[PDB]
């Protein structure tokens, strides 16, 4: 990704949730 | 247009060690006079080299300082190559340099000071390199700067506080570095600033309030830092903000209601923070939100039905909070929704019918909540659902059909009130790697269709009432690692096809009706770690072929009909932390070399309730680091081996209900300082009571009852603090019974009948 187009929306993550067993 | 530039370019070519694509070969073949037609090279009207641009040409080697000898150079673009070494310090000499883009290379060392002296430079991209050192204060004086990438380097130190001077800045991104200290407040004075990414650093202190003054700001990314205090309400005044990422920080206090004023917002992620109170309703005024999550915070109160307004919402993480009250029934209003996680909260109520409405739903995590009611039948209509975790809730009813058409992977519905059978259509989804129904009321058989889902890694049907045999289809699973069917009504013989699971690391069949000869084939599993067969109808001798599983941390044959003597072959497994052979028909002596071949066993050795006869093997001394030993209720004959003075990790020791005789050795208990409970009760033990019992600080319950012990009671026990339950009872003891101690609240029963005791 070029520096011109800037920081995109998906450049950061979503908080992942654990699995219960 | 003359020689000096040509020499600069040639001297740049040299120094490039590897050119596999053969790009620079062009330069060789075209010739030196036609050089303005060279690949990557472009000149101006007057014929001077201006732009050197080579991207993804896979060039290795170093950047020769000779580039400084191209005077009219404006743009140098090296993007995405293998260039190593340090950026040439003479680079300050260019002076016409517009954009220096070194992005995606191996460049190292400190950023050349020369760069900061350039008055013509706007676009500076150093992102993705090895550059170390710090951002100098000098950067504030180079005023032509607009876009500065520092992302993913080794840069350290603090962000220059004078950065607000860099007036033209539209973008500053330092993300993925070692920067420390706080965020310069002067940054909030850049009015043309659009994008700011400080994420993935050590930065501390509060977010500057004056950040509310940036009206062109679109992306604000502070994530994965040490930032403290609370989100400033001033942020509510940035109207151009499309994306706000505060996550993974120390931020505290309530979420500013003024955040509801940023209506251009798409992503708002404040998760993994200290934030408190309740979600301001104003947040539901952001209707362009796609990604939102509040998860991993201290937030309280309910989730308002007004989430139904968002409607562009894609991912929602509310998990790991204190949220309470009714479930957000209006969640079905967002049909773009893919991930929804409310897990780890106190949320109650029922899932909405027409939940099936969502369709796009991939992840549903409601786990660990107060939710009751049936799984909505409309869930049949979510065709994109890979993950469903409803586990640990109050939910009722029967598992619906339709899971066959969902294409799932993980299902944990366990720890609920669910009744009825296991729908057979549930086996029509072959991608399921995890099936856990454990701890419910589900009734029925386990049908051979189970064989249908080959991909499964873990299967838990435990703690239900299920019946019938175990289908041979079970063998097809292949990659199962955990199989737990325990605490059900399963009957019959263990199918030999279970030998076909070579990846299975644990097996719990315990508390069932299982019986018959354990299939020989089942001993061909070398990878099986834990095996619990306990509490079943199993009879006959313990197969020597049990030796064929040499890696076992856990083995329980307890509570069965097992015949004969402990097979010596069992010496083969030295990895056992827990060996429970207790409550069976086992006869004969304990094999010495089995007790020896278990050298380090860290937890539980229980032979209790058997017909075992003999002296207690001296090889029990070889057992060290063992916490519990229960030999109770057996025919064991002789005196206690002093050899076991060597196990100091013993907490509970039960020799009770046996034929053991002779004096209780003091020498053996000196070692067992750690003991918490000690049961010698109901034996032939004679002689005095060991004085080292007084040296036991962790002793709580001591039972010497029903013995031949002849001594005067040792006072040592009196003043001992941690002692709680003491049993003397039937015995012959003499003289004064100790006063101050557990003897204060003592029951007469514990001393009776002792014949003569003064008191």
């Amino acid at each position: 990704q070029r520096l011109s187009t800037g920081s995109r929306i998906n450049s950061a993550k979503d908080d992942a949730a654990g699995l219960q067993i | 247009s003359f020689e000096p530039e040509i020499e600069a370019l040639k001297s740049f070519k040299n120094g490039i060690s590897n050119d596999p694509l053969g790009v620079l070969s062009d330069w060789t073949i075209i010739g030196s006079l036609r050089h303005c037609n060279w690949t990557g090279i472009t000149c101006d009207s007057t014929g001077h080299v201006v732009s050197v641009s080579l991207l993804e040409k896979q060039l290795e080697g170093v950047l020769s300082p000779a580039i400084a000898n191209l005077t009219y150079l404006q743009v140098l673009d090296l993007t995405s190559n293998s260039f190593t070494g340090k950026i040439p310090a003479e680079i300050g000499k260019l002076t016409e340099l517009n954009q220096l883009i070194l992005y995606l290379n191996y460049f190292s060392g400190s950023i050349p000071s020369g760069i900061w002296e350039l008055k013509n430079i706007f676009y500076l991209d150093l992102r993705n390199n090895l550059l170390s050192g710090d951002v100098p204060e000098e950067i504030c004086k180079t005023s032509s700067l607009v876009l500065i990438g520092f992302d993913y380097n080794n840069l350290t130190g603090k962000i220059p506080e004078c950065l607000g001077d860099l007036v033209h800045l539209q973008m500053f991104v330092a993300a993925g570095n070692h920067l420390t200290g706080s965020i310069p407040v002067s940054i909030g004075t850049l009015a043309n600033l659009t994008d700011l990414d400080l994420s993935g650093n050590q930065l501390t202190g509060k977010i500057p309030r004056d950040f509310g003054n940036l009206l062109n700001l679109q992306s604000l990314v502070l994530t994965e830092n040490l930032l403290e205090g609370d989100i400033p309400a001033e942020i509510g005044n940035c109207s151009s903000l499309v994306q706000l990422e505060l996550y993974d920080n120390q931020l505290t206090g309530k979420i500013p209601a003024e955040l509801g004023n940023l209506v251009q917002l798409q992503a708002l992620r404040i998760y993994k923070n200290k934030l408190t109170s309740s979600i301001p309703s104003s947040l539901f005024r952001l209707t362009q939100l796609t990604h939102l999550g509040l998860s991993e915070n201290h937030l309280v109160g309910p989730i308002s039905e007004e989430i139904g307004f968002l409607e562009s919402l894609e991912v929602l993480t509310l998990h790991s909070n204190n949220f309470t009250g009714e479930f957000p029934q209006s969640i079905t209003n967002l049909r773009n929704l893919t991930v929804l996680t409310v897990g780890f909260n106190n949320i109650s109520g029922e899932l909405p019918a027409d939940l099936g409405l969502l369709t796009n739903l991939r992840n549903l995590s409601a786990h660990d909540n107060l939710l009751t009611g049936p799984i909505p039948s409309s869930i049949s209509n979510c065709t994109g659902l890979k993950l469903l975790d409803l586990s640990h809730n109050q939910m009722t009813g029967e598992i619906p059909r339709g899971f066959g058409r969902m294409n799932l992977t993980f299902i944990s519905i366990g720890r609920n009130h669910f009744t009825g059978e296991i729908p057979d259509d549930i086996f029509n989804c072959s991608n399921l790697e995890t099936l856990s129904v454990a701890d419910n009321n589900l009734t029925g058989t386990l049908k051979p269709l189970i064989g249908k889902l080959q991909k499964l890694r873990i299967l838990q049907v435990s703690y239900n009432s299920l019946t019938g045999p175990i289908p041979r289809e079970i063998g097809n699973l292949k990659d199962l690692n955990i199989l737990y069917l325990h605490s059900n009504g399963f009957t019959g013989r263990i199918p030999r096809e279970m030998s076909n699971l070579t990846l299975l690391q644990g097996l719990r069949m315990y508390s069932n009706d299982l019986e018959g000869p354990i299939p020989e084939e089942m001993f061909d599993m070398k990878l099986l770690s834990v095996l619990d067969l306990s509490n079943n109808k199993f009879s006959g001798q313990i197969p020597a072929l049990f030796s064929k599983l040499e890696s076992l941390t856990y083995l329980s044959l307890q509570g069965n009909k097992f015949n004969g003597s402990i097979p010596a072959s069992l010496k083969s497994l030295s990895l056992l932390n827990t060996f429970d052979i207790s409550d069976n028909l086992l006869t004969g002596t304990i094999p010495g070399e089995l007790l020896a071949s278990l050298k380090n066993m860290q937890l539980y050795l229980n032979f209790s309730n058997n017909l075992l006869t003999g002296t207690i093997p001296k090889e029990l001394g070889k057992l060290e680091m063992v916490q519990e030993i229960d030999l109770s209720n057996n025919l064991f004959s002789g005196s206690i081996p002093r050899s076991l003075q060597a196990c100091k990790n013993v907490f509970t020791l039960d020799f009770s209900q046996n034929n053991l005789s002779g004096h209780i050795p003091d020498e053996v208990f000196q070692g067992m300082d750690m003991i918490i409970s000690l049961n010698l009760s109901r034996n032939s033990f004679s002689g005095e009571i060991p004085q080292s019992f007084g040296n036991m600080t962790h002793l709580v319950s001591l039972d010497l009852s029903s013995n031949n012990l002849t001594g005067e009671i040792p006072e040592s026990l009196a003043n001992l603090s941690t002692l709680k339950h003491l049993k003397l009872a039937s015995n012959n003891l003499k003289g004064h019974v100790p006063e101050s101690g557990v003897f204060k609240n003592i029951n007469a029963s514990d001393l009776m009948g002792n014949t003569d005791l003064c008191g």
Binding site: A16, I21 | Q505, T553, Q602, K648, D673
Partner: protein, 175 residues
Amino acid sequence: NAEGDALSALKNSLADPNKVLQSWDATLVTPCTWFHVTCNSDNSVTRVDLGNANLSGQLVMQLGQLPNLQYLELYSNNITGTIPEQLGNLTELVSLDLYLNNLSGPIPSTLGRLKKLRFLRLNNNSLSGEIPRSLTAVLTLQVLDLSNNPLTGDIPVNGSFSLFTPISFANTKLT
């Protein structure tokens, strides 16, 4: 959780031919259902038993991320590298067994800040350096078997070592 992440870090630093750590799934809410991992009623990791798993690799700093860790058994493996000082950050840790490994370097002084420590066996290793005086401070120490790894610098009698029969040293190039 964080503890599951710590153990995941340990797992990434290790080669596992016996597939012992196959049971370890970082995506789980806790690593309490993981094999060779045992937690308490509050889900905090208590024991880790990796002994004789024929693993190979280096230890990790995140081993300090398990506050309730009591028994740590890595003994009898091919594991190399040093012993991270963050092992001192464990408050209540009853038994530390690194013995029968290729681990090298000094024994960190931080190993003396665990006052609940009973069993410390570093023996049969490559460890080289000086003995921390704080190992005389901890006083619990029912067993210290450390030997077979050349260290020297002295043999402290500073008084929690007053109780040791000295197989406890046994070719330390000691004194």
